[PDB]
Amino acid sequence: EVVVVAKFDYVAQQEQELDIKKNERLWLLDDSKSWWRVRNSMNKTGFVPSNYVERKNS
Amino acid sequence: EVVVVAKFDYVAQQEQELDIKKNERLWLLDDSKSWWRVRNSMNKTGFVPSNYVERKNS
Ligand code: NA
Ligand code: NA
């Protein structure tokens, strides 16, 4: 239901990303959640909700 | 270089997401950028930087 508008162009850097143009309108998915891209100890990469992770102090 | 720690478990909902467990340590990729998942007018889905889009008021 939530529509967003591109403020700037973005050229996708990876196949999971999307190319967008300034002023393009898009559906915002996943209840408007913010994501971080992470890599685990087995070298698998993917997106997780940014609220579920925090920087480590060590 | 930046390591994050899972605060909670997360079960991935899509193949682009990652399953993580509480207390797991992960590499944070993409200069710690936040992402939104969007769908365009051609029904292609992907992640874009959340700073590059904003909610539309119409
Ligand atoms: Na966080
Ligand atoms: Na934004």
Numbering used by the authors:
A (entry chain A), B (entry chain A): 5 to 62
The authors write:
During the crystallization efforts that led to the monomeric apo- and peptide-bound Nck1-SH3.1 crystal structures, seven more structures were determined that all exhibited domain swaps, leading to dimers. The swaps are located at the exact same position in all structures (i.e. Lys-36 in the n-Src loop), clearly visible based on the high-resolution electron density. Dimers are formed by exchange of the C-terminal 25 residues, almost half of the entire SH3 domain. The interface thus generated contains a short anti-parallel β-sheet encompassing the CD3ϵ sequence 36KSWW39. Superposition of the Nck1-SH3.1 structure with the bound CD3ϵ peptide shows that domain swap and tight peptide binding are mutually exclusive. The C-terminal half of the SH3.1-binding sequence would get into steric conflict with the second SH3.1 domain in the dimer. All of the dimers are swapped in the same manner, but with different juxtapositions of the second SH3.1 domain with respect to the first. The hinge at Lys-36 provides quite a bit of flexibility that allows the dimer to pack in many different crystal lattices. Indeed, the hinge region varies over ∼6 Å within the superposed ensemble, and the distal loop covers a distance of ∼8 Å in the dimers. Given the large number of swapped, independent chains present in different crystal forms and grown under different conditions, swapping seems an intrinsic property of this SH3 domain.
